[PDB]
């Protein structure tokens, strides 16, 4: 009836056929080869360290990543905290302009916006 065999002694054909066919699935291949994280902007990471290269539209900045060397745009929440990053600052970025600024100079931006901490220079 259907394409698949239906014998009692035909488990080998079904198992071999499934093993052959699972390779044509994108998730299976990218999870067995370990290359599924190159489509992400960060690579395999969840946060990326970067250098504050220029102050850009008005809220965002232009930050060069330290790992691969390419330069992206970064979102700085609470627009006044735009002035905390100055030049060549060491920042830690998370995805949101698809990026955002989380940890500037080791400390977090929420500890500076609420004046909990101060930036080590």
């Amino acid at each position: 009836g259907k394409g698949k065999p239906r014998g009692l002694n035909s488990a080998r054909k079904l198992r071999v056929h499934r093993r052959n066919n699972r390779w044509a699935e994108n998730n299976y291949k990218k999870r067995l080869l370990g290359t599924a994280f190159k489509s992400s902007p960060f690579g395999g990471s969840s946060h990326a360290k970067g250098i504050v290269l220029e102050k850009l539209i008005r809220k965002c900045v232009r930050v060069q990543l330290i790992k691969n060397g390419k330069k992206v745009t970064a979102f700085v929440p609470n627009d006044g905290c735009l002035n905390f990053v100055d030049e060549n600052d060491e920042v830690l970025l998370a995805g949101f302009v698809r990026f955002k600024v989380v940890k500037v100079s080791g400390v977090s931006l929420l500890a500076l916006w609420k004046e909990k901490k101060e930036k080590p220079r």
Binding site: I66, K67, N68
Partner: peptide, 23 residues
């Protein structure tokens, strides 16, 4: 090399050691 940070650190180190060896 492998990382941009590593190659810039290597550049700083190699100009430092050229300066040292000409010293």
């Amino acid at each position: 090399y492998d990382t941009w940070y590593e190659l810039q650190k290597a550049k700083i180190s190699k100009q430092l050691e050229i300066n040292n060896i000409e010293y």
